């Protein structure tokens, strides 16, 4: 009776694929061929941040384009001032193998995690002045891969245990647990509406998740290897996924299929981080070749290269206003580009 | 200039001083990674060094030199993802149960996978063939030998330079040296000359285990200095 269900699932998958292909009236290229090119988008390093004792693995920008948080595997969270370069805070982490960090939009709390399977929320506006652990929640059976804040009381986190969960800080319990992918989750990306978010896993698939309803509304399988990076489009209708196959694919939710594949023959290294500009024309993806290349979302042509690093670019993020771009690498240097 | 800006610069200088103070200790201590399947006696090795946590930590001191040994406690079977975080460490300790021949193939496969990793291709891999007494007893029993699992054992002879311990049976020596030869031929293959293995025979009660760790770590750091002096 199990083979019956297997064949039924296969038939449903074939039907879904046929319905998806039926809507493939034209490719994004044939529509974006007539548009003018973005041209050589040359960028220069305006600020160089130093002070990290180990590899920089995670960074995130807050609501303001000035403050910046970065995480290193030495057990230190440093709040950097992009304008004056002055260090604002230094948090000694209880776990040195940190792999993710997030800056809440309220500017008061910051979360982090890693191989310890525990997510510690640090308070920056503590009346005592020093940084204190507000809540240290646990429950995941794997390393935390990515964390993102929805509000000052709710946080979504991904773990290597293949399952995601939405946490409530004031109590410290899983509000809703998702079914999970077929492999370890690697990245998270919240939509601008705060109601939807897409997560990538090592099984080369991406699923659209709803915050309130703990279910998957859409699933994508356009990649051919582990997805290491994912970012939502500024409008919340599409998202790009970075994988170790040295190719970045743009997935649209309304179309429900891949529209463009950013790849080059001279690139063989995998993608570690992906980010979109405020307008969406510039796609910034970090490659393992020690260089970060900018891609035209519409033309798919390379608009520039940010080779101001000497090691694997592990994390990168564009400000909410698109004034500057921060690129982090294992070389312990975090440079703020134009 | 603004007074708040000067105060922020002073706070940044203090944070930099604290970061330097922490980096001092970070560079003083050495990091070690302990890998091994459940069948391996890694738990006994960790608990004997009296000298839902996803990661476990153990610290010991050999000849005043501090060592940090990390071991994953609660994680899935896959390893290609979280293994990247343990790079830049002093060395990796791989433990395998040399007695059980069934799980030996999986152990060799895991060792080959960890050795050919693109991100760990610059970290030496320490090899401790634990549980030698059980292997000796099993190969002396004569019921089931390595030949039943590996065909090369039918035409492999003990090397000429094989120095066995006083009172060891020739069969035990030949078996352990065949296992060591398998490990060495798996390691040297695509070794690149930048990282080498350190096979060592140990048991569940040998107190010299930490001494071997220190001895091979002293040599690993030596090679790192030569590549620096030569600008490789």
């Amino acid at each position, epitope marked *: 009776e199990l083979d019956q269900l297997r064949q039924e699932a296969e038939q449903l998958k074939n039907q879904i694929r046929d319905a998806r292909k039926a809507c493939a009236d034209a490719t994004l290229s044939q529509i974006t061929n007539n548009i003018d090119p973005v041209g050589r988008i040359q960028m220069r390093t305006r600020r160089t941040l130093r002070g990290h004792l180990a590899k920089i693995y995670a960074m995130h920008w807050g609501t303001d384009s000035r403050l910046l948080v970065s995480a290193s595997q030495d057990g230190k969270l440093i709040i950097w001032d992009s304008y004056t370069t002055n260090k604002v805070h230094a948090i000694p982490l209880r776990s040195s193998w940190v792999m993710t960090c997030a800056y809440a939009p309220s500017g008061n709390y910051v979360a982090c995690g890693g191989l310890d399977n525990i997510c510690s929320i640090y308070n920056l506006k503590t009346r*005592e002045g020093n940084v204190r652990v507000s809540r240290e929640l646990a429950g995941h059976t794997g390393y935390l891969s990515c964390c993102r804040f929805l509000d000052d009381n709710q946080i979504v986190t991904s773990s290597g245990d293949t399952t995601c969960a939405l946490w409530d800080i004031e109590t410290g319990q899983q509000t809703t647990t998702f079914t999970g992918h077929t492999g370890d989750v690697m990245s998270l990306s919240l939509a601008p509406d705060t109601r939807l978010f897409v997560s990538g896993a090592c099984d080369a698939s991406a699923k659209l998740w709803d915050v309130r309803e703990g279910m998957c509304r859409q699933t994508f399988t356009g990649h051919e290897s582990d997805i290491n990076a994912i970012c939502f489009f500024p409008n919340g209708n599409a998202f790009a996924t970075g994988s170790d196959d040295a190719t970045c694919r743009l997935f649209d939710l309304r179309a429900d299929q891949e529209l463009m594949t950013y790849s080059h023959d001279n690139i063989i290294c995998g993608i570690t981080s992906v980010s979109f500009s405020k307008s969406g024309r510039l796609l910034l993806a970090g490659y393992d070749d020690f260089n970060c290349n900018v891609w035209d979302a519409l033309k798919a042509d390379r608009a520039g290269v940010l080779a101001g690093h000497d090691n694997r670019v592990s994390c990168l993020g564009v400000t909410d206003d698109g004034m500057a771009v921060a690129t982090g690498s294992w070389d312990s240097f975090l440079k703020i580009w134009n | 200039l603004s007074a*708040e800006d000067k105060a*922020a610069v002073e706070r940044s200088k*203090m944070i930099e001083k604290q970061l330097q103070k922490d980096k001092q200790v970070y560079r003083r201590t050495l990091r070690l990674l302990l890998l091994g399947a459940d069948n391996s006696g890694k738990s006994t090795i960790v608990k004997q060094m009296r000298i839902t946590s996803g990661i476990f930590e153990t610290k010991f001191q050999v000849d005043k030199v501090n060592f940090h040994m990390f071991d994953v406690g609660a994680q899935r079977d896959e390893r290609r993802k979280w293994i990247q975080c343990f790079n830049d460490v002093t060395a990796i300790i791989f433990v395998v149960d040399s007695s059980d021949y069934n799980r030996l193939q999986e152990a060799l496969n895991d060792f080959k996978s960890i050795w050919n990793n693109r991100w760990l291709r610059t970290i030496s891999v320490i090899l401790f063939l634990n549980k030698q007494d059980l292997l000796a007893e099993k190969v002396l029993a004569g019921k089931s030998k390595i030949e039943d699992y590996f065909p090369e054992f039918a035409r492999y002879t003990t090397p000429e330079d094989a120095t066995p311990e006083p009172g060891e049976d020739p069969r035990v020596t030949r078996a352990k040296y065949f296992i060591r030869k398998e490990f060495v031929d798996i390691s040297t293959a695509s070794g690149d000359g930048r990282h080498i293995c350190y096979p060592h025979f140990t048991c569940s009660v040998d107190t010299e285990n930490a001494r071997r760790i220190f001895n091979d770590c002293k040599d690993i750091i030596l090679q790192m200095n030569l590549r620096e002096y030569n600008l490789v």
Partner: single-chain antibody
Amino acid sequence: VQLVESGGGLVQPGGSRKLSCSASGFAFSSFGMHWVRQAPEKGLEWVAYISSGSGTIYYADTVKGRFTISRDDPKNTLFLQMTSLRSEDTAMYYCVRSIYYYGSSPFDFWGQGTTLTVSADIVMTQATSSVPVTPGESVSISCRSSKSLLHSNGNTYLYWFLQRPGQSPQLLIYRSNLASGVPDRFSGSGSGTAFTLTISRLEAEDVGVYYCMQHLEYPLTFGAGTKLEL
């Protein structure tokens, strides 16, 4: 968080005295200490300043050479050694903590202070000194300065302190940006030269004196102080 001062009392002319302050409930080293004096029935006046880790120290041109500030981090205690005490030194000294960084709130907690009795830069001048008002009406305290506090970076270095009968000055605004622990009734506006503290609804807890202060340059100077009665 508490700042209990000690060492006050009566002193003769030319003598000395060591005013101590016990800090608790926070990282004393992380916060810079500020000694502020208040003459009897008069306004505030900055005295000295010591940064974190004793890396920087400043004194007022009127007290330079006489007073010296020191802080013992191991015990989380502050000390102020005074020399050549003059008759004018009769005043109540207050110890204030302040942490400086983007988004902070310097001068957030004011200690109880201690009473001690004997025997060219920017200046803050307030045009109003008393404003009679009854419940239901609003208040708008004005402030004038001789130099535009709008630094090149665009930050408005304006600080308001409300001292109530028996209590120490409480921080209301540190930069339009309302301070913590104070209702939203208080609001600030104005340009780099002129400033205005507007309160929408006046409650029975606003009775006191409102003091203005600039922070563009380290040497501080408080204003005459505007008093509200109700």
